[PDB]
Design a protein around this ligand. Structure first.
Ligand SMILES: Nc1nc2c(ncn2[C@@H]2O[C@H](COP(=O)(O)OP(=O)(O)OP(=O)(O)O)[C@@H](O)[C@H]2O)c(=O)[nH]1
Ligand SMILES: Nc1nc2c(ncn2[C@@H]2O[C@H](COP(=O)(O)OP(=O)(O)O)[C@@H](O)[C@H]2O)c(=O)[nH]1
Ligand SMILES: [Mg+2]
Ligand SMILES: [Mg+2]
Lengths: 424, 244, 247, 423
């Protein structure tokens, strides 16, 4: 369990994807030319995970995105062969990404995926970044996943999927596309970090006091969360080391693998962080719902499993104390029938900008609130049958929408069942 | 459908180095353990031996050497049970070389009267018979009915009786039984029917009533007449109660 | 649009498949020389692997109705068909994740199985797929093998001993396979062999080699089975058998 | 009388390093294998060039841990064919260790064991080092133990298990893996010494004075107590001179073969009497498994002293405890404490936080209070299996779900077995 193949699909996919590579290239001490100018061994200890030059494949039906990446800061480092791009765009139609246009290109993508996997000592799994309200990131992404799932069934599938919100785009077909994609991810991926644009806006607007957040502002919150959750994977460490071990200790029931991520402290784009937080302060950004990257209240549900990643030089004695504290002083919020369900890990190398930081990966039943929002919007749209002729024209059947609607509601019911469960 | 389709097992690799000297040793318990090991550890487990390219006619000719000549009755008993296992788990193999290598030794050793030993020798002779039909046994079984030991007469004649009950050769007529019926089979069974001992004669009486059942109580009415009226009603006694 | 069945755009192939499906139901039973999807079976062998999941499913239901329009005389050329057709059907039809794409592929194999004299020419072609990467394929094609038996069965099969050995060989590995479904659906195939032979035979060659918990479940499964050791009447007949019954 | 050691999973492999580090210091053996100086050849073999090689196999379904062995201080000590690694680990899943991944490498492992057993003349048996909660430690070991009971069935096999503890726990499913291996390894193990990582943690925080112990801290402490048990086999003592004697003295019931080990003294590196250290053997604070022997009956009890010890001081310390404490025994047991002594001093590691002590003792006692440890695992197990939590991971890697229940019933039956002896 060593290498990870990375994929980014759709506009958002390549945006937060490149942003992720910007962050972790710095953290590992790699320049845009692809040469090591670091000064520590803890950096190159597990550089073979994401690098060889990135093990990254760039995909979009929109050919313009090609240039938006290469003209970016670290755009020079990506392998030219790993660029696979179509002629036209999907235009927010999941069916075009999943059945028609995205399907015609998906073969060319699998050829590059094969090429990168072929020269791997021992593959771990895959990593996809994309948006769920689009046509390419959702439609072609979910189609790529299934196509990989069946070509590489001995590997983990881990996605960074961002949820659409009216606060970021007023397109009304997004409830359709996202619901159809959740119907896919619940069956096709081992673990999925739920990035909610609703929560990214509410954090940039209310906590960071930015009146108009841009994509870059929301993308800053994402790339830092990604580097936080992938800290275990990229540096030496005992706990939650590889993709499979993580999912083993996080996902008790296969369908309930949608994590509510959140991290601290919340900083602005390049602002000045004069006063470093204390260990008890970081700890009290867990239940603090203003730090969750998903728009849910942990107080309204119960945690099945929790993984905490503390970055920076600090007292391991104090972290253990604070985590053991916050668990038992809120014992009614953690499920009793899974003992030692919270797991903490420390990494001495902090993220750039911060002296200390802490990311809070949680499988909380409160996540059902997120799926409620998508379902109510989907049903409001679907009961009036709006814009269906787009999807049906591309070969989809009206039945598909009803199945995805019901399958997501079953997923909501499941979360509610284990919320009301008792150990007795 | 025949359950015999099971994959074949090989036992040559199972043999130990200290086997050839142990079986050809002067100490009885060396020989016993040698045979008893390859039987309980190597033969008894298996259920189908390897038909293809396996020569057992080196192993089988040393089972014959002991069944015939070995003075230890215990080493004989465990050897004839080994011989049976080979003939049982490897059906259709004992065509001539194999069948004939142990046949005439087995018939010599029917002389043994210990119940357990006669049990094993006869049961082994039943194995070679059921898989060598009438190839070499029919001629040689007769030869040993003419033998001087009383016990080999009654046992080799009982053998022909056993075989005759399981006689179901293919074809309408002109089998090996008819080519030599009156010339040899009947002339030899009468030597048993007219023996000095009663228990010997009484085996012939069955072995003649099992013969009539096969080949018609009318065809053999010629030597029936030459027989005593007193022996006749004993032969008929078995004819009424004997099946094939 | 006859040659458009190989056209570049998907939605024009989707038509040609519907056009064909309407033809094989509305064409003549005696059959137009236009019905030449027998002498060149590479054509539909290509169509079943359409490269478009929606137009694929429509090619399979066209093959399906084709493959029952052929139930009339003289079509002794069903040998060539099973060779050309069921490897694509198993490889990429049973494989499919689509509800309907799978269901019609199985039904197709049914019709190709009863085109044959027995089940032998069908099993030997779909046996290799048990050794495939994808579990849901071996998960499925063990279910499909199991129901070409429960409805047809072994009759008119030359040398059955060679055939039973060929299908019993992988059953140890299948029952120790990682996938839950591959295992669960292998105990069903074991029962369907028990349901047709005795318990004596399986326990001598196979049951010995499985996990103890497994052979318990197989025994528990035989008690719930009621009916004579070989089934008295098959739930489905072949083509030469039904015609013989009629005359 | 040769004895082969096997190390499975990171726990086994990394504790192995600590033990063979400590064995080579006790026997004056060099990192390169040489020796400027038999009873100790129970564990080591010899090259024609005067080099002393361990009789050991290292196994992990993953290179990382064993790669550090063959590039470490003791890279020259082991033959490269002894260090075996796969590529995909078991990922804290007993199923992968036992069924899916373990079967891909089990034959290579058994083959390399035959090469060490072929060098040996009168092989005694096997010592096995592995974790409970690990996927490799639970799954692969239980598989390897099954196969060793065939290929070497007529000889002994001893366990050194690492009982899990939330303070260093890497997985939620560690109760599952513990129960699953203990079920399938119960019939194939003759005796098994459990090591509660919590007690080793507690000891290192109290007596070694460490805030947050590392694995090196725990392993070194563990290696000291493992050495005390294997000292009788390596120096030709009077007690426990071969692997059978462990079963004879400590195992009066095939199933209940889990002794409680207590070690004194643990002195920080920043002398006591024979009587003082023997009283600490009946103090729960110095046990390796957290329980209360006062709530249980003793089936057997051995004392392994080593160092500056007068045999009469022992008998005084024994009579003191036999009179001034109430150690309850079972009625069908020898009421006498077995004893053995080895006058060599306890070796520590140069640099270790543990100090050189004049004398030391390791008490091995098969008390029924160790059932409390099984109750803690079974209870944790019950909570998660009541909702069938995490069960799909196991079932998806070649394991039948029923095996969970068959294991739990075997653990419930073992809890009754401990009760009936002690009433
Ligand atoms: N005392 C001690 N415990 C250890 C050590 N290494 C691991 N453990 C414990 O063993 C348990 C399982 O971890 P591992 O032994 O590394 O797992 P593994 O055997 O390698 O199995 P996989 O990694 O899943 O393939 C954890 O609960 C750890 O606390 C060690 O060196 N010393
Ligand atoms: N966080 C974030 N979300 C984005 C970004 N770009 C688009 N989105 C969201 O993704 C959805 C649009 O899908 P998009 O990825 O642009 O379409 P695609 O190119 O076909 O994959 C909407 O819900 C947007 O809010 C971005 O840069 N950052
Ligand atoms: Mg776009
Ligand atoms: Mg490990």
């Amino acid at each position: 369990m060593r290498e990870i193949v990375h994929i980014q699909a759709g506009q958002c996919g390549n945006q937060i994807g490149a942003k992720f590579w910007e962050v972790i290239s710095d953290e590992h001490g790699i320049d845009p030319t692809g040469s090591y100018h670091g000064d520590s061994d803890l950096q190159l200890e597990r550089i073979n995970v994401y690098y060889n030059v990135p093990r990254a494949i760039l995909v979009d039906l929109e050919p313009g995105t090609m240039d938006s990446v290469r003209s970016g800061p670290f755009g020079q480092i990506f392998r030219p062969d790993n660029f696979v791009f179509g002629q036209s765009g999907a235009g927010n139609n999941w069916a075009k990404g999943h059945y028609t246009e995205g399907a015609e290109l998906v073969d060319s993508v699998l050829d590059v995926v094969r090429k990168e996997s072929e020269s791997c000592d021992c593959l771990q799994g895959f990593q996809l970044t994309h948006s769920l309200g689009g046509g390419t990131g959702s439609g072609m992404g979910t189609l790529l996943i299934s196509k990989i799932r069946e070509e590489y069934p001995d590997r983990i599938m881990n996605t960074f999927s961002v949820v659409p919100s009216p606060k970021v785009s007023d397109t009304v077909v997004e409830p359709y596309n996202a619901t159809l994609s959740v119907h896919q991810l619940v069956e096709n991926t081992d673990e999925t970090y739920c990035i909610d644009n609703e929560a990214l806006y509410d954090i940039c607007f209310r906590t960071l006091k930015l009146t108009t957040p841009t994509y870059g502002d929301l993308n800053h919150l994402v790339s830092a969360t990604m580097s936080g959750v992938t800290t275990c994977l990229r540096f030496p460490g005992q706990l939650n080391a590889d993709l499979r071990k993580l999912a083993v200790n996080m996902v008790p029931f296969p369908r309930l693998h949608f994590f509510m991520p959140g991290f601290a402290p919340l900083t602005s784009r390049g602002s000045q962080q004069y006063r470093a937080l204390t260990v008890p302060e970081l700890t009290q950004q867990m239940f603090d719902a203003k730090n969750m990257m998903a728009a849910c209240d942990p107080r309204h549900g119960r945690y099945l499993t929790v993984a905490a990643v503390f970055r920076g030089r600090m007292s391991m004695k104090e972290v253990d104390e604070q985590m053991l504290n916050v668990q038992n002083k809120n014992s009614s919020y953690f499920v009793e029938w899974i003992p030692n369900n919270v797991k903490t890990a420390v990494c001495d190398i902090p993220p750039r900008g911060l002296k200390m930081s802490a990311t809070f990966i949680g499988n909380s039943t409160a996540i059902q609130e997120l799926f409620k929002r998508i379902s109510e919007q989907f049903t409001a749209m679907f009961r009036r049958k709006a814009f269906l002729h787009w999807y049906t024209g591309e070969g989809m059947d009206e039945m598909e929408f009803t199945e995805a609607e019901s399958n997501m509601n079953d997923l909501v019911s499941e979360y509610q069942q284990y919320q009301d469960a008792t150990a007795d | 459908d025949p359950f015999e389709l099971l994959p074949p097992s090989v036992i040559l690799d199972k043999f130990p180095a200290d086997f050839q000297t142990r079986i050809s040793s002067t100490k009885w318990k060396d020989r016993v353990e040698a045979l008893e090991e390859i039987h309980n550890n190597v033969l008894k487990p298996v259920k189908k031996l390897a038909h293809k390219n396996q020569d057992y006619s080196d192993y089988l000719r040393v089972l014959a050497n002991v069944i015939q000549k070995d003075a230890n009755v215990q080493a004989v008993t465990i050897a004839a049970n080994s011989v049976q296992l080979l003939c049982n788990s490897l059906r259709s193999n004992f065509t001539r070389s194999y069948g004939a290598i142990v046949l005439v030794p087995l018939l010599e050793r029917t002389k043994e009267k210990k119940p357990s030993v006669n049990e094993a020798i006869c049961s082994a002779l039943d194995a070679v018979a059921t898989y060598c039909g009438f190839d070499d046994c029919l001629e040689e079984t007769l030869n040993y009915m003419k033998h001087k030991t009383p016990q080999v007469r009654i046992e080799c004649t009982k053998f022909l009786t056993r075989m005759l009950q399981g006689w179901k050769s293919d074809g309408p007529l002109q089998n090996q039984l008819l080519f030599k019926l009156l010339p040899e089979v009947t002339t030899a069974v009468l030597k048993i029917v007219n023996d000095t001992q009663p228990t010997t004669r009484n085996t012939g009486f069955e072995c003649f009533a099992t013969l009539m059942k096969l080949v018609g109580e009318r065809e053999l009415a010629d030597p029936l007449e030459k027989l005593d009226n007193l022996k006749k009603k004993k032969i008929y006694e078995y004819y009424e109660k004997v099946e094939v | 649009l006859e040659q458009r069945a190989s056209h570049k755009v998907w939605k024009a192939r989707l038509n040609a498949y519907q056009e064909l499906n309407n033809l094989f139901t509305k064409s003549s039973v005696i059959p137009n020389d236009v019905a030449n999807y027998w002498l060149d079976p590479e054509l539909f062998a290509s169509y079943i692997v359409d490269s478009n999941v929606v137009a694929q499913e429509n090619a399979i239901i066209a093959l399906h109705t084709l493959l029952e329009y052929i139930s009339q005389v003289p079509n002794v050329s069903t040998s060539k068909l099973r060779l050309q057709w069921i490897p694509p059907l198993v490889e990429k039809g049973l494989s499919s994740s689509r509800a309907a794409t799978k269901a019609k592929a199985t039904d197709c194999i049914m019709l190709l199985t009863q085109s044959d004299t027995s089940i032998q020419q069908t099993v030997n072609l779909m046996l290799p797929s048990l050794s495939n990467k994808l579990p849901r394929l071996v998960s499925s094609c063990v279910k499909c093998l199991a129901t070409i038996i429960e409805e047809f069965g072994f009759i008119n099969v030359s040398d059955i001993n060679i055939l039973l050995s060929e299908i019993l060989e992988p059953l140890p590995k299948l029952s120790s396979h990682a996938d839950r479904n591959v295992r669960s659906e292998t105990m069903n195939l074991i029962l369907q062999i028990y349901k047709w032979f005795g318990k004596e035979l399986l326990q001598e060659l196979l049951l010995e080699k499985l996990k103890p918990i497994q052979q318990r479940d197989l025994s528990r499964m035989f008690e719930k089975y009621e009916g004579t050791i070989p089934p008295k009447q098959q739930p489905r007949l072949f083509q030469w058998q039904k015609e013989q019954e009629q005359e | 009388r040769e004895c082969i050691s096997i190390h499975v999973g990171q726990a086994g492999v990394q504790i192995g390093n600590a033990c063979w580090e400590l064995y080579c210091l006790e026997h004056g053996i060099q990192p390169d294998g040489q020796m400027p100086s038999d009873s100790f050849n129970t564990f080591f073999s010899e090259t024609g060039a005067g080099k002393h090689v361990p009789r050991a196999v290292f196994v992990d379904l993953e290179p990382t841990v064993i790669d550090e062995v063959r590039t470490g201080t003791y890279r020259q000590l082991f033959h490269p064919e002894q260090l075996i690694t796969g590529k995909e680990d078991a990922a804290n899943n007993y199923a992968r260790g036992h069924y899916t991944i373990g079967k891909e490498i089990i034959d290579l492992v058994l083959d390399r064991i035959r090469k060490l057993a072929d060098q040996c003349t009168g092989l005694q048996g096997f010592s096995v080092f592995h974790s409970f909660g690990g996927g490799t430690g639970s799954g692969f070991t239980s598989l390897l133990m099954e196969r060793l009971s065939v290929d070497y069935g007529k000889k002994s096999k001893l366990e050194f298990s690492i009982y899990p503890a939330p303070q260093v726990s890497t997985a939620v499913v560690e109760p599952y893996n513990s129960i699953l291996t203990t079920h399938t390894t119960l019939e194939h193990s003759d005796c098994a010494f459990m090591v509660d990582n919590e007690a080793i943690y507690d000891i290192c925080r109290r007596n070694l004075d460490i805030e947050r112990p590392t694995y090196t801290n725990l392993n070194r402490l563990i290696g000291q107590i493992v050495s005390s048990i294997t000292a009788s086999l390596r120096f030709d003592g009077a007690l426990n001179v071969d692997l059978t004697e462990f079963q004879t003295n400590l195992v009066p019931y095939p199933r209940a073969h889990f002794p409680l080990a207590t070690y004194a003294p643990v002195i920080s590196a920043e002398q006591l009497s024979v009587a003082e250290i023997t009283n600490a053997c009946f103090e729960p604070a110095n046990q390796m498994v957290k329980c209360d022997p006062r709530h249980g009956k003793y089936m057997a009890c051995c004392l392994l002293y080593r160092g500056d010890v007068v045999p009469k001081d022992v008998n005084a310390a024994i009579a003191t405890i036999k009179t001034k404490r109430t150690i309850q025994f079972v009625d069908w047991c020898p009421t006498g404490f077995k004893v053995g002594i080895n006058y060599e001093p306890p070796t520590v590691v140069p640099g270790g936080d543990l100090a050189k002590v004049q004398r030391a003792v390791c008490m091995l006692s098969n008390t029924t209070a160790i059932a409390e440890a099984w109750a803690r695992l079974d209870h944790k197990f019950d909570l998660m299996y009541a909702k069938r939590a995490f069960v799909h991971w196991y079932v998806g890697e070649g394991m039948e779900e029923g095996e969970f229940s068959e294991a739990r019933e075997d653990m419930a039956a073992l809890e009754k077995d401990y009760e009936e002896v002690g009433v």
